[PDB]
Ligand binder design. Structure first.
Ligand SMILES: CCCCCCCCCCC[C@@H](O)CC(=O)O[C@H]1[C@H](O)[C@@H](CO)O[C@H](OP(=O)(O)OP(=O)(O)OC[C@H]2O[C@@H](n3ccc(=O)[nH]c3=O)[C@H](O)[C@@H]2O)[C@@H]1NC(C)=O
Ligand SMILES: CCCCCCCCCCC[C@@H](O)CC(=O)O[C@H]1[C@H](O)[C@@H](CO)O[C@H](OP(=O)(O)OP(=O)(O)OC[C@H]2O[C@@H](n3ccc(=O)[nH]c3=O)[C@H](O)[C@@H]2O)[C@@H]1NC(C)=O
Ligand SMILES: CCCCCCCCCCC[C@@H](O)CC(=O)O[C@H]1[C@H](O)[C@@H](CO)O[C@H](OP(=O)(O)OP(=O)(O)OC[C@H]2O[C@@H](n3ccc(=O)[nH]c3=O)[C@H](O)[C@@H]2O)[C@@H]1NC(C)=O
Ligand SMILES: COc1ccccc1C[C@@H]1COCCN1C(=O)c1cc(-c2cc(C)ccn2)n[nH]1
Ligand SMILES: COc1ccccc1C[C@@H]1COCCN1C(=O)c1cc(-c2cc(C)ccn2)n[nH]1
Ligand SMILES: COc1ccccc1C[C@@H]1COCCN1C(=O)c1cc(-c2cc(C)ccn2)n[nH]1
Lengths: 263, 263, 263
C-alpha cells in the first residue's frame, strides 16, 4: 500500500504490493518490487532499483544508480526468497549495492541505522552492518562479513568473507582485510595488520579516560604480552569486571572464526 | 528484427535495426542501438545501455547500470566501427563496462560463455575473456588483456595492458598484475608474484592426480630450477609429450609478450 | 533557457531555469536541475544526473550513470548552495561522480578542460582538477585535493584529503597517495613514494632537453642531496632564474600543506 502522503514520480515503476510510507519520495526512473517496504520519509533520488523481500526504514536517503535487495553474487544462490533489512537515517550513495541473503548463510542481509555508505560501497549477501558505520568509496565486503557499530572502512578497501570488523575499528584505505579485527583497533595494510587503539574515535564518542586506558591494556594483552589468545581471554574477562567496555573483546572473541589480524 | 516472443518494456528504447531473439527480455529504461544483436532468452534487467556493433549470445543476464559495447577509453580511438562479441550464459552484474575494440588492436573485444563479471568489473577495448572466468567486484582490465578459460581475478585487482592471465589461474584480490601469468598459477600482490599451482581449482575441475603432478613439475622448472625460460621451454615441451595438460604452458609462452611474473 | 538548437530527449527531465546551449544534446532519462548550465555542443549520453549550482562548458562528453553537481559526502555539509565548475572538451565516463563544494572548503569544486575522467573516477567536494589530466578507472580523490595540469593518476589509486598532485606528475595504479607530490615526479606505492622525473611525459609535451635536465637537477636537490627542504628551496629558486620550468617547484611548495612524499 502506498501512503496518500508519499510522492511517486510518474516515471517510477512501483509494483503492486510494495509498501511506501508517509512522506516518502520515489524519484524519476526508480523501480520498486512488490515485496519492498519503504519507511516514512525515505527518499529514492532517481534511477534506484529496489527489489526482493526488502524492508527499508525511515528517513533514509538513497542516491541514483544504487541497487538494493538485488540477487547476490554467490554462485550457490539459486533464487530462494531471502531478505534485506535496512534501518533508519542511512545515507546510501550513488551506485551502492546491497544484496539479498542466501539460505546457506541465514537468509538475511542486514544494515542498521545512521550509516554512511559512500559511492560504490558493496554489502554482499548475509553481511551484517551495525549502526553509525562508514564505508568509504569502493569499500567492498565479501559475503557474511560483520561490520560492527561505529566501525569505519577506508576508500578502496576490501574485506574477505566471514571476517568481523569489530566495534569502533578504523580500517585504513587501500587495505585488504583477511582476518578478524578486534573492537577498538586501527588496522591498515595488505593484508591489514593492527596499529594500536583507535583512541581519537573513542575520545570523540564519549569514552572515559579510564575506559580508554583499560582498552589499551587489553590491546597490550592481545598483541604485546607474548601470550596466546587462550591465555589472555580470562585476563581480558578479569579486566572487564572493572571496566565494562572491555567486555566488547570477550563478545567479539566468541564470534570470531578467522583468527585475529596480527603483525 | 524483434522476435514476436521477445518482451520489450514500453520505456525501453530499441533502435530500428536491432535484433532481439526469441524470449529475450529488455527491461525498463534500457537503450539498445541499431547494430546490437541480443540472443534468445537474454535478459537486460533495467537501465542497461547496449550500443555499437555488438553481438550478445543466449541466456545472458545483464544487470542494471551496465554499459556494453560503449566507446572505449583509448585516446587513440577515433570512432571507427569496431566490435564486441559476448557468448552465452554470462552473468554480467551491476555497472559492468565492456567496451568496443580499436582498429589498432584488432577491432574486437570478446567475452566467451558461462562467465561471472561482478559489480563494476571492466573489460577494456581489445580484451579477450574466455569461458567460465570470474572477475570479482571492481576487477579492472586495461586494453588488450587476455583472461583465459577458468581464470579468476579477485576483488579490487587491476591488470596492466596486454598482459595474459593464463588458463585456470587464480589472481588474489587487492593485486596489481604487470606481467603475464602462466596457466595453472596462483598470483597475488602489488605487483603480483607467483605462489605455486592452483591445485584446488584443478582438483575441482577434474584434472587427474598425474596431470596435477606434471603441472607442479612444470611450475618447478619455471620458478625453482634456476634455469632461464629459454632452457626450460624444451623441457616443458618434453614433459607435455606424456601429460597433454602441460602443453598449455607451451601455448601460453607463444602468446606471452610481457615476460612472466616472478618472485 | 534552452537554446532552440539544443536537443532534449522527450524522456529527459530538464527543470525550468536550466540553461542549455546551442547544439547541446540531453539524452534519454537524464535529469538536469534548475541551476545547471550546459555549454554549447556538450552531450549527456543518457541516464546522467546533473544538479546543484553547476556550470559545464562546451563540447563535453558525459556518459551514462555519471552524477555531476551532487551533494558531497562530507558529514560537515548541511545543504548550503555550493558550486561545481567544469570547463571544455572533457570526456567524463560512465559512473563518474563530481560533487559540489562545502562552505568550509571554499564553496567550489572545479574541473578544467581537455581532461579524461575514466569509469567511476571520483572528484570530491572542493577538489581542483586542472587541464589535460587523466584519472583512470576508480581513481578516487578525497575532499580538497588538487590535481594540477597534465597530471595522470592510475587505475584503482586513491588520494588522501588536501594532497596536491603536482603538474605533469604520473601516479601509478594501485597506489595510495598520502602526501603532496611535487611537479614532474613519478609516484607509486602504498603509500606512494617518488621514483624520479616523468621524463617521457615532459619529452612528449615539448619540454626542452635543457629544461628536463634542470628539472632532474631540482629533483636531485629535493631527494638526493640530503639537505632539508628549507635549505633546497632557495637553491631551487636560484636554478629557476635560468630555467623557468623549475619555478613550478617554488609555486608548488607555497601551496603544499602535507609535506612531500618521500622514500
Ligand atoms: C585481501 C582480501 C581481498 C577481499 C576481496 C573480496 C571481494 C568481494 C566482492 C563481493 C563478492 C560477494 O558479493 C559475493 C561473495 O563473496 O560470494 C562468495 C561467498 O561469500 C562465499 C561464502 O559463502 O562462497 C563463494 O566464495 P568461495 O571462494 O568460498 O567459493 P568457491 O569455493 O565456489 O570458489 C569460487 C571459485 O574459485 C575457484 N577456486 C577456489 C579455490 C581455489 O583454491 N582455487 C580456485 O580456483 C573455484 O573453482 C570456483 O570457481 C562465493 N563466491 C562465488 C564466486 O560464488
Ligand atoms: C599495477 C597495474 C595497474 C593497472 C591499472 C590498469 C587500469 C586500467 C583501466 C581501464 C583502461 C582501459 O579502458 C583503456 C586503456 O587501457 O587504454 C590504453 C591502451 O590500452 C594502451 C594500449 O593501446 O594505450 C594507451 O595507454 P598508454 O599508457 O600506452 O598511452 P600513452 O602512451 O598515450 O600515454 C598515456 C598518457 O600518459 C602520459 N605518459 C606516458 C608515459 C610516461 O612515461 N609518462 C607519461 O606522463 C602521456 O603523456 C599520455 O598523456 C591507452 N590509454 C590512454 C589514456 O589512451
Ligand atoms: C592511502 C590513502 C587512502 C585515501 C582514501 C580516500 C578515499 C576518499 C573517498 C571520497 C571521499 C570524499 O567524497 C569525501 C571526503 O573526503 O570527506 C572528508 C573531508 O574531505 C574531510 C576534510 O574536510 O573531512 C572529513 O574527513 P575527516 O576524516 O577529516 O573527518 P572526521 O574528523 O569527521 O572523521 C570521520 C570519522 O572518522 C572517525 N575517526 C576519526 C579519527 C580517528 O582517529 N578515528 C576515528 O574513528 C570519526 O569518529 C568520524 O566518525 C570528510 N569525511 C567524512 C566522513 O565526513
Ligand atoms: C583515516 O580516515 C578514514 C579511515 C577510514 C574510513 C574513513 C576515513 C575518513 C577519510 C576521509 O573521509 C572520506 C573517507 N576517508 C578515507 O577513506 C581515508 C582513508 C585514509 C587513509 C590515510 C592513510 C594515511 C592511511 C590509510 N587510509 N585517508 N582517507
Ligand atoms: C581467493 O578467492 C578468490 C580469488 C580470486 C577470484 C575470486 C575469489 C572468490 C572470492 C569470494 O567470492 C567473491 C570473490 N572473492 C574474492 O575476490 C576474494 C579474493 C580474496 C583474497 C583473499 C586472500 C587471503 C588473499 C587475496 N585475495 N578473498 N576473496
Ligand atoms: C603507467 O601508465 C599510466 C599511469 C597513470 C595514469 C594513466 C596511465 C595509462 C595506463 C593505460 O591507459 C589506461 C590507464 N593506465 C593505468 O591506469 C595504468 C597504470 C599502470 C601501472 C603499471 C605499473 C607497472 C605500475 C603502476 N601502474 N598501468 N596502467
Amino acid at each position: 500500500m502506498i501512503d496518500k502522503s508519499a510522492f511517486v514520480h510518474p516515471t517510477a515503476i512501483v509494483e503492486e504490493g510494495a509498501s511506501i510510507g508517509a512522506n516518502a519520495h520515489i524519484g524519476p526512473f526508480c523501480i520498486v518490487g512488490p515485496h519492498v517496504e519503504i519507511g516514512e520519509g525515505t527518499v529514492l533520488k532517481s534511477h534506484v532499483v529496489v527489489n526482493g523481500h526488502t524492508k527499508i526504514g525511515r528517513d533514509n536517503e538513497i542516491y541514483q544508480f544504487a541497487s538494493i535487495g538485488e540477487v547476490n553474487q554467490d554462485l550457490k544462490y539459486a533464487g530462494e526468497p531471502t531478505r534485506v533489512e535496512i534501518g533508519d537515517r542511512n545515507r546510501i550513495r550513488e551506485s551502492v549495492t546491497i544484496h539479498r541473503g542466501t539460505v546457506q548463510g541465514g537468509g538475511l542481509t542486514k544494515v542498521g541505522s545512521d550509516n554512511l555508505l559512500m559511492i560504490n560501497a558493496h554489502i554482499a549477501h548475509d553481511c551484517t552492518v551495525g549502526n553509525r558505520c562508514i564505508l568509504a568509496n569502493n569499500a567492498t565486503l565479501a559475503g557474511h562479513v560483520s561490520v560492527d557499530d561505529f566501525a569505519i572502512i577506508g576508500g578502496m578497501t576490501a574485506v574477505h568473507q566471514f571476517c568481523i570488523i569489530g566495534a569502533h575499528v578504523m580500517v585504513g584505505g587501500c587495505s585488504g582485510v583477511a582476518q578478524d579485527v578486534p573492537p577498538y583497533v586501527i588496522a591498515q595494510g595488505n593484508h591489514a595488520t593492527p596499529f594500536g587503539v583507535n583512541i581519537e574515535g573513542l575520545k570523540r564518542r564519549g569514552f572515559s579516560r579510564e575506559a580508554i586506558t583499560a582498552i589499551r591494556n587489553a590491546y597490550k594483552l592481545i598483541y604485546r604480552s607474548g601470550k596466546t589468545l587462550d591465555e589472555v581471554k580470562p585476563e581480558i574477562a578479569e579486566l572487564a569486571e572493572t571496566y565494562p567496555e572491555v567486555k566488547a573483546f570477550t563478545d567479539f572473541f566468541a564470534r570470531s572464526t578467522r583468527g585475529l589480524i596480527r603483525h
